[PDB]
Design a protein around this ligand. Structure first.
Ligand SMILES: NCCOB(c1ccccc1)c1ccccc1
Ligand SMILES: NCCOB(c1ccccc1)c1ccccc1
Ligand SMILES: NCCOB(c1ccccc1)c1ccccc1
Ligand SMILES: NCCOB(c1ccccc1)c1ccccc1
Lengths: 529, 190, 77, 113
């Protein structure tokens, strides 16, 4: 009620109120509607632009005021604004309206009782559409274009250069935006957020200048790592020394044939310490990302430890000297799937492996065991109970052999000699044909099981999972990069409006054609010598 | 295999997969080969083997190849005769075939993704360009004498010369009529 | 239409073939202790307090209206 | 046949008329007693809806779910169970009740085989 509201303010109602009731609700979906509890934010939350136009013209209205959660009003719009496209979308229109109605820059620097700026809160809550505004925010005015996040270097017809204010965006401060987008697990649309221009070309530039060359470098180390375990254990040049020991460092060795044995012992310990720190860090990620990412921290660690435990097993000489080595070697070649990131279609094939093995193999295997164990009992009448004509003279296992000789057919490694019986081989094979046809239909539906929007969803989601699972590697490499000599990107610090020459760090782009306008922006040139 | 409209359109799809996506599949298929092959080569030369070290050579290599012949389907059982580990041999080797089925099943899905449009249509449009390059190559092969061919008759344009320019005749069609003011108002002539 | 029909109809046949199981289990459930769902019996308009059995939901956003409906609160202790 | 028009809309399977009968919100006050959907409360864009649900639930003879789900004649049983009074009621019978019996009747008939 807009007319009744102005009467109450004229009657002296408290405009800076706070409603601290139990409608905050961590169990949000019922009885909730968190809106930051102030009367200014409530008109701002519920599409009441005229009342916000009324309340912000009241001089007693504390626009900079906080919440029990420490939230200011721009935190409150962030915590409501859904990732629905254009619900005649008012919040981005009204987040725009509050900063342009009033406020210095000292409103988005305010932190809540989690310590988050509203740019960071928009990233942690994952509200993409409000974050497409905050990272752009071009302001074509000149009382207050200092509040803008996008600028212009120059404009010359349909070619123009855009500049991003980029303060908390880049991974240079504690808990940056990419720090809280890419490492986040809770939100759904991380890929819908990293498509955005300040995050995208910054991720590309970290990729091209920096992370591509480390990834190929950490490829060729961990690839020569697994060759060495293959060329130490299973090489045997000519006539090995009477069941030797692989990682042994015996008295006389030329320094090409044991430095590789040192190369394993170093780079296994180099990996074992690395994700051993990730024990101290990744406490909530592993159970929440129950299938998506950060498993490769584990499978690197299990592979690295079982190499080292094979060395600890040598000092005590138990029976599983060779056993713990080979599972350390088998995971070592299976770990190359982490290095199948990097080519745009390679991981896009590798994610489809990780999708089927995690989700849909146990789908197929539970049905395939079922008709196996179903016809296997039906087959094991024709072993040990039926004719058999010559049998009970071969090995063991009446039910088990009947299963396995029905279980070798899926390989195609089919045996006829297990079937020699008396006049039941008519009934044997027409049973066993109805195994293959039934385990063809389980196979044929398995192709259709992956079908269902394979034209779109199975291809595109496996691409967008891959881009997130490569963008997490790149920010991990910057933690690996030492603090000295980050003489890199984060372009030159040009002016904004103010008296300081270097105002802020920047990022340059190359925007384009139609919808011209007669520009009034900036230094009217080309970028300069 | 250029020349028939669907023949090269199949042949381009060969050239697409062999160049782009075989090395995709082969790098993963070598990987689980070499992954389980080390896992298999415990059960050669280190395990029971029950009668072995009497056949040819190559402890790791034979364990790879007898795991590598299965993808043909040319499968050998006689390489597997060991002591109580053939329980553990075959359930290892089954998990090779299922894992190299999922690499095969995703390989069909790897070509999928707009196969309704893009894999069919781009392989057609690559083919039409790869046949149109042949045709202009044949005119370089054709000797300069007797190109008495196409490039139709040189009718007037506006000007005083009768033969003005070389031409090409088409047969355009229906609705959106207009009362025409163009040219010689006839049918094309004897 | 495997992109649509073979996937979606096999889903909708399944939801019907699971919803038939659930009502079959209530025939299996003995009549004593069905102390379960069928939420509280709030008023409708009339003089009786308990009027009818109910079911609570959580509807959402835009197309607001100035509501004249019911007890103007949050659901209560 | 002894059928209420809600039941007749279910047995004949006319889905679109049954999306009205199970909702039927009436924003008046001579006759909002005829409404089947109510409101608990309304506070901005969060609001709580209440369903009158008399013959709907499987608590009387030949209820609506009794005559939708056990029906075989009609085509669009899935287009009818998507509806909100039938849906969340089927979810709540699933979560509170039928999920645990199904796993229980799983582990009996699985230990059976
Ligand atoms: N030209 C962009 C290249 O960088 B992108 C990229 C490519 C491979 C791996 C990781 C990132 C990218 C970044 C953000 C959004 C979309 C793509
Ligand atoms: N201190 C541990 C370094 O290991 B690296 C590594 C870390 C995690 C996963 C895989 C490899 C590495 C990185 C780049 C190049 C070479 C190795
Ligand atoms: N959130 C709904 C969960 O219940 B639904 C459901 C899920 C599995 C099996 C049976 C029912 C459902 C009920 C009605 C329509 C659509 C789905
Ligand atoms: N009186 C017959 C009970 O059988 B049960 C059953 C009935 C029909 C189909 C399958 C099983 C059963 C139900 C729940 C748990 C355990 C068993």
């Amino acid at each position: 009620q807009g007319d009744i509201t102005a009467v109450l303010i004229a009657a002296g109602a408290d405009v800076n109120a706070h409603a601290k009731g139990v409608f905050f609700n961590p169990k949000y979906q019922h009885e909730g509607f968190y809106f930051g509890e102030t009367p200014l934010a409530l008109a701002a939350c519920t599409n009441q632009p005229e009342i916000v136009q009324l309340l912000m013209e009241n001089e007693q209205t504390d626009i900079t005021s906080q919440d029990s959660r420490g939230n200011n009003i721009l935190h409150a719009l962030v915590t409501v604004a859904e990732d629905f496209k254009t619900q005649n979308d008012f919040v981005k229109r009204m987040y725009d309206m509050i900063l342009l109605r009033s406020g210095n820059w000292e409103l988005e620097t305010m932190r809540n009782n989690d310590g988050l700026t509203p740019l960071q809160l928009a990233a942690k809550m994952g509200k993409a559409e409000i974050l497409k505004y905050i990272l752009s925010r071009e302001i074509k005015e000149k009382p207050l274009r200092s509040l803008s996040r996008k600028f212009t270097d120059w404009a010359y017809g349909p070619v123009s250069s855009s500049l991003y204010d980029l303060t908390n965006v880049d991974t240079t401060t504690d808990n940056s935006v990419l720090e809280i987008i890419v490492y986040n697990t809770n939100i759904d649309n991380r890929h819908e957020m990293l498509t955005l221009e300040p995050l995208h070309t910054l991720l590309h530039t970290k990729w091209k200048k920096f992370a591509k060359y480390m990834f190929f470098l950490s490829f060729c180390f961990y690839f020569f790592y697994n060759i060495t375990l293959t060329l130490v254990s299973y090489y045997r040049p000519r006539e090995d020394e009477d069941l030797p020991h692989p990682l042994a460092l015996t008295h006389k060795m030329s320094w090409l044939q044991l430095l590789g044995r040192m190369f394993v012992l170093i780079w296994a310990t180099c990996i074992s310490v690395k994700e051993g720190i990730a024990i101290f860090l990744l406490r909530p990620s592993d159970l929440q990302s129950i299938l998506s990412d950060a498993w490769f921290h584990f499978v690197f660690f299990v592979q690295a430890v079982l190499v080292i435990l094979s060395v600890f097993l040598y000092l005590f000489a138990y029976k599983e000297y060779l056993a713990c080595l080979v599972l350390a070697m088998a995971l070592g070649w299976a770990n190359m799937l982490y290095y199948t990131r990097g080519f745009q279609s390679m991981g896009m094939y590798s994610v489809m492996i990780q999708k089927v093995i995690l989700h849909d193999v146990l789908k197929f295997l539970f049905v395939y065991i079922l008709f196996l164990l179903g016809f296997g009992v039906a087959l094991a009448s024709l072993i040990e109970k039926c004719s058999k004509d010559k049998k009970d003279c071969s090995s063991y296992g009446s039910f088990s052999d009947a299963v396995l000789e029905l279980f070798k057919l899926t390989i195609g490694l089919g045996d006829l000699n297990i079937q020699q019986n008396s006049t039941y081989p008519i009934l044997f094979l027409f049973l066993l044909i109805t195994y293959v046809i039934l385990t063809f239909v389980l196979l044929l539906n398995m192709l259709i099981a992956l079908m269902g929007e394979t034209v779109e969803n199975v291809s595109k989601e496996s691409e967008r999972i891959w881009r997130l699972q490569r963008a997490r590697t790149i920010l991990e490499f910057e933690k690996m990069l030492p603090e000295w000599l980050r003489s890199r990107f984060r372009m030159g610090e040009l002016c904004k409006v103010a008296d300081e020459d270097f105002r802020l760090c920047l990022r340059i782009n190359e925007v384009k054609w139609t919808e011209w306008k007669t520009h009034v922006s900036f230094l009217n040139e080309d970028p300069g010598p």
